[model samples]
Target chain A: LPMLQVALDNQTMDSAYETTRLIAEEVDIIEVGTILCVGEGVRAVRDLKALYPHKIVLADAKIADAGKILSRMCFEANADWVTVICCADINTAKGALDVAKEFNGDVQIDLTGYWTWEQAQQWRDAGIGQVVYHRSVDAQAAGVAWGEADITAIKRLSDMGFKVTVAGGLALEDLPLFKGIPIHVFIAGRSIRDAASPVEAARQFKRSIAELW
Target chain B: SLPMLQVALDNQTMDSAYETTRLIAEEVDIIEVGTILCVGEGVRAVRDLKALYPHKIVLADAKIADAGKILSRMCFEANADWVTVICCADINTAKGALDVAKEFNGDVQIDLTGYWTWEQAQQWRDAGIGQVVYHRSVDAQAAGVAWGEADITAIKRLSDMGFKVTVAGGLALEDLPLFKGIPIHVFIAGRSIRDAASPVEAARQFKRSIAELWG
Candidate 1:
């Protein structure tokens, strides 16, 4: 069964708060997107953690370097999970994973638009717990749709005992396609966030997941 | 008078930056709001640092990678006297930086760290970039190569090109003799003065050496 994660891609904290508050009952995790982190600073992470102490709060601090310091900061601010770019050096990834271990938090290696299974295994060996099988935002912007190859890769990784997360243009209508696909998480951003009624849209996603599973 | 000295505040917290800068602000001619600090604390760090030392030039190290127009506007709105754009960033970013700098009547300095080429320097010069920062690469410094003639040659080349060059990276007081004939516009000293017990005395020594060499 894949968990539904709501991505707060809004530019301001107030909008994030409203969206999270409205969809808190339906979503399993709250992702403080990169734009919100850059706009609201640590407060975005802190506020979400404060409001939903029981829910998993992931700080998407798309860190390119200085991994240890950033990981420590996000975990200290109460992030249960944080993201470090796969393009970052091995030293940075190890540093972030080490820091995540200290707080009992998990490090999600975002393999977005780069790397292979061998590289993913290297990060796993270095102490990362999960992998985010993300499509490139750049590619998506260029009109590249998620293809059968992407689904096959996700399914293959999941079968190998990796906790796989599928993201990038996640839509409600596309839920049935991922049924029994071994995805641990389904991350929806603009699909749910930009809808006219975010909570109702989130409910539709949850109901679809329930029906598919 | 010699060109100004700036301490790059790349720390994670404003408190640490304040403590470090408080000890060396009098010695430093300018204060840099490093990329890490700006990303961590945002524009408030710049505002507070400037309020603390009204006389110092506040430089925002934005390191604009993309969305140059928006970033340049934000840095200027934050009251930065100068903002840095990477030499590797696209021409549009550089143009946007120059446009904003012109609008605000502020200065622009290109950091030639990862991307330093003669062609890039020529483009920056043609675009009216006010300053260029050159230093021995950090990888070379970490490898423990003693500063030598090669560095001086590069500095001379940049000087001959009519660009105001600023040099940094692990600069010590004893190295002052090496910069004698080098026409540097600014000398950025970080850990040397910040770590010194008497920062003011150390700064005075650097100024005196520059005067003896250039005067």
Candidate 2:
């Protein structure tokens, strides 16, 4: 079954955690997003880990360097996974991977920075097996839309043994398009967050995935 | 009255970052929640530190790459008085950050970690960015790089470009003398104060040094 991840990219702490409390049980992973961590800090990860102990929490640190210290802290905060910048030097990414190993956690490289298929394979060759294909937030805010290319990227990533996650203003309607695409996680931000009925939004996401798959 | 002391709290946890800041808060003009610390502890570290010491300017050193408004607003809403954005960010990203700062009535700093051109910097000033963290190089690569005449000239020129300059990345108490006549507005030092035998006094010593030089 495909997973739903609610990216708490809300502008403030109040909205971020509020949506999670409303939809966490319906999702597989909860992203303590870069914005949330920026607003509430990594304690958001710690609190989320404790608050939603049953599910996985990913600290979207979007670490560009000093991978070891950053990754270790997120894992210590009880994050099951942390994010690394794909544009980061391999050694920096490796540092995050090494610390992730120390804590028995995982590192998911956010593909926002100049990540090409060749680079993706190179990362896998270097023992990285998780990737997040994100549409740039600014672009997303500019009304950019994501579709077939993302699913194709998901297919390519899974073939390389990666647990691929996709995000970027995704709505429940987008889930039907993602059906049968081998995506390990589907992340919804504004879609579920801005819905008049957030719980219904989450259920709709799950229903779409189920009916399509 | 001109030079300000901003202590960089780069501790692994909020506890240590706060402990060190608490001891030195009274002695400095700004409190920097390091890029390293936030990556490790998260934005709550910035917010908690702000709650503890609201009098001092709190800088969230995210070295932002993109989502300028989101990241800048993240730090600003956490009560950061100042936020650092990478000079290398695309113009749109930089503008987004400046827009948020304008909205919140906060300040945006361009960290020239990798060396951006003067023309590029002037554009930032024109875009309403008033500060630049002009580094000899990023601390991560400061192993043996020394301050150069070109760096000295960059300061004089940046001052001419109408931006308040902050000198960072491996700054020490001893490095102050080297900048005697330079127009740096703020000085940031982390391990020097945090690792000293008496951190509070060490912070005081830094403040004393700056007052004597530029006050």
Candidate 3:
């Protein structure tokens, strides 16, 4: 079954706390989205983990460099997972992975920039276990929608042994589109975070995942 | 001095970053809230540093790879004079950041940190970004990559292409001569300043060196 992850990409920690409190019950994972991570720092990850000890908290640091140092900050703060940008050097990713191994945590490569399977192969071979197949915020703003090509990429990564997470303007209706695709997680930000009833919005995604997968 | 000195406060903690900035803020032309500090301390790091050193230009090395609009606006709202976007991000990412920067009269610098090509640099220039950080990757530097002529050639090419280039990565007084006569806009020194026995003197030496060479 696919897990529902809520992206708390709030501009402030107070706003993030409010949203997490509202949606914690319905979602399986809490992502301290890149904006929140940058604006609030490691304390955000630490506080969230403290608030929900049982829940998996991932810091979406979108680390571009200083991979080991950045990843260590997140893990030392108790993040179950952290992210690195695909655009960064593979050595940077390796640095992050090295820290993750020490903390018994995991790292996800955020595919928010230009990438190729040739590069993706390098990550998989390097023992990176998770990859976020995203339609970036800018691409989504320019009318790019998730479709067959996204699914193909996700399947290819999954076949290569990566647990794929799909994000970028996901809706409850978009859930059916990804049936039988072996998605590890489906990330919803504004859909649940900005909904009139954030809890109901999250439950809809959770319920949809239960039905589809 | 022709090339301004930028002190990169990349300390692991906000207090240390603030202390490092406070020590060298007067000597440096720009205060860069380094990527680690930006990620670990957040925009508050930029806000506090900008507050303490109002005269110094504050740049949040956000190294934005995604969510360009929000991250760029957040940094600028904290009074960051400039923010960075990685070279590998889509052109739209850079454009989106540039749009937000315009509202606040701020600028976006494309960080050519990892593998990047001149063709890509041209695309950024065409997209209307005026600044770039030509990096000697810290990872590569740790793995014994030395600063050389190729680094100078790239900086010169970037400058000639009408970009205001900031040269960074493990720079010291001795490395300054290698960049003499180049149209370098800024020279970033992180560990060379922050981890020095006397950050104030380290920054002053950098200024003196830059002045001697580019005066």
Candidate 4:
């Protein structure tokens, strides 16, 4: 079953609060976006954790180097799942995995940019069950649009028995495009955050995913 | 008077690193529990160092990548005066560190290692990030290329961006000429001080060079 994840990428705590308050009931997992985390610090996570104790909270900590220690700290602070960069070394990956296991937390490997399918397999084999598939912010800024190659890669990886999560400029209208694509999670950031009413936006997203899938 | 001197203790053992640091405690201004040390010894090192030297500035080089809130709180509870997160750790991590620093009245230093950009500097400065660490790429320095124009240029640019720049990496007393008239808030020396035959004498020499260059 594919879950709907809302990315709270706002710069201010007020904005994050308002958006989360509105869409709290709709999304399966609430992601503390990199920007909001920077702006509000752990208070952002704490506040979200307090507000949505039942819902899963993803701390987009993006563990790069000191993976285990960082992951342990995040999980201790009530994160259900934490993110680690694929570019991080194997030792860091193993350390983060260990921390996750210690806290009974899950690790999500973010395939940010220029990653091969072989690398995805390596992550899965390394005991990471979930992976994020997305185009690079650099590539998107350079005017590269998401196309069939991305869809094909997502489809291929899903077929290979990996839990595929898709994000990056995803919109509610585009949900139908991913029909029968075998995606386990769909991350919506600007599409829901930028909407006039984020809760309605999230509701629409949930409906769209249901209709498409 | 110039700012304080700090030793980056990326050593593998806390007891040895502490014994080594205790000998030069008077000469050292800030005692940094480097990322390598943190990973090796965990938070116990930071706590013990703070207990021993309560007045000294203890920096935990968490090199935080994500989970900004939890990591910052842990470092604070460990009694760290300053904590670090990598520049490539994402804006959220930086922002989280900044907010936590404000609450604790602690300081944050951004290590511009993998993610160095002028635009990023602008954003950090705009966010009121007061301190920045400028390090010459170890690979480039080991290859015998001096801290070239690009390195100096970055120092000047970061200075212009209104940051208190700290220059590090294989720093020596002779290289003071390269930094003459350049405003740097802190000068970090590791092997130059720690591995010297006479650590105190070596630290004195480095301090004298800074006074001569900046005075």
Listed models, DockQ each: 0.11, 0.24, 0.67, 0.06
Docking class for model 3 is: medium
**What fraction of the reference interface contacts is present in each model, in order?**
0.04, 0.33, 0.63, 0.01
- RMSD for each model, in Å, please? 6.1, 4.8, 1.7, 9.4
Measured against the true structure, the TM-scores of the candidates, in listed sequence, are 0.67, 0.75, 0.95, 0.58
Q: Could you arrange the candidates by DockQ from highest to lowest?
A: 3, 2, 1, 4
- Candidate 2 lDDT over residue span B1-215, tens digit each: 45888888888778777678767788888889898787666677778898988777889889786688878877888888889876655555678888898887888898776425566776787777889987544324433567777778888889888889999867788889888887788888887888889899888888888888886
| lDDT (Cα, tens digit) per residue for candidate 4, span B1-215 | 47467887766567778766867877878888876466445566788788988889998877665556657777887788998876754565577778898898898888764335577778788877888878653333453647777878889889888888888767787876887778888888777888889888888887877777778
**Interface RMSD (Å), every candidate:** 5.8, 3.9, 1.2, 9.1
The TM-score of candidate 1 is: 0.67
Candidate 3 pairs with clashing backbones: none
lDDT of candidate 4 at residue B198, scale 0 to 100: 88
lDDT for position B106 in model 4: 95
Q: Which stretches of candidate 3 lie over 4 Å from their true place?
A: none
Residue pairs with colliding backbones in model 2 are: A40-B44, A41-B42, A41-B43, A41-B44, A42-B42
Off by over 4 Å in 2: A10-17, A86-91, A113-126, A147-163, A175-182, A210-213, B1-4, B12-15, B36-55, B63-67, B86-93, B111-127, B134-165, B170-185, B200-215
Q: Alpha-carbon error at B32 in model 2, in Å?
A: 1.1
